[PDB]
Amino acid sequence: SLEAIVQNASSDNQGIQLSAVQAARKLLSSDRNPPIDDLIKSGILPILVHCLERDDNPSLQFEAAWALTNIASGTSEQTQAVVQSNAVPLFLRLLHSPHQNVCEQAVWALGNIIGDGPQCRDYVISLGVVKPLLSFISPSIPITFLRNVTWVMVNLCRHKDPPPPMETIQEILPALCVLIHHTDVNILVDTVWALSYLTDAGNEQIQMVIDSGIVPHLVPLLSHQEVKVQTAALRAVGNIVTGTDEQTQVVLNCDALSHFPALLTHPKEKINKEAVWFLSNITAGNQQQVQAVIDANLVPMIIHLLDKGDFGTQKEAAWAISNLTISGRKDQVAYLIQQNVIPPFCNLLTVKDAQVVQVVLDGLSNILKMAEDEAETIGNLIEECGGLEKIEQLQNHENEDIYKLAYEIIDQFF
């Protein structure tokens, strides 16, 4: 009976009050479809927030913080009701409790609030959460507490519109530099996912991540035994190599490409796909980065995935092939030709994905444009592949660019 719980939670008899707040916590924690709206509409929120002030009773504030944590774990509606009740300043104050459980429950609640969205985390950031949060990182912290802190850190880096403020990224990067040397798998997964969110926010953030010194410790995680670590690390370095040529070179200079044989042959197709996506952002670089892909012996496997991979991997591989014809020399492209790129590249011309068909027609045109001395022979390869029929029936395609360069290629090179 919730009206009675709310009344009792007000009581000046401590036993009555603690019992009521515990009954609310139990209603919010016993399964994972708690009656959050019922408790909110009861009026219990200001009483719990008041209980957060009871520094004389660490058990009372722990129970209230737990109840509020679980209300804040609901819909954005329910999280914002907690925020509207002024809980955030009281939680920030609890970060300085001498009582580790109380601190931890305050961290947990703030993590739920921060995770609701970017204006919400900006409010929590403006009130100074980051420094006390990061001050918890220590060899003496219980590991389950450290995992809660790192989850909150991921939550602080998760929204990119807008991304967290520059000053916050500057504060969080040294903590991630510390945690990337941790052995616990959960810590590492959180740390690297936080890095993947930070590197997805543009080239200035990528430069900050590079400037922190963390990349030489991120790249070796591409070969971690835990596939969740590998997945996150591959996302993060992939984001970095979407940057400039010099930012890409930083990653390459960490021995990145030596990790890719195992990613390109990985049993998990999502790994193969992200790996080829990464590689495609390398073959879009200068001739030396193209050559680095060639000398790492990755091209036969890229072509194999272009041939036999899942559709997503095939799309990334078509991009890696087409990209190589940007700053690649004629001999690098000729090496592609000697690796029998043409049949599995032409078989993509039938896919209904107009973007893929475009990219493949692009690459074919570029390679034909610069292979003069035996362009005719390459035409044979396109012809005897069955690819010339693909182009001569893409003649009747819907997309303007598609049939445009289909007619163009069939005119000049056939």
Partner: peptide, 12 residues
Amino acid sequence: EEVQRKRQKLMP
């Protein structure tokens, strides 16, 4: 893409 955003504290 598995990294939690919101976490109910259940009694362990």
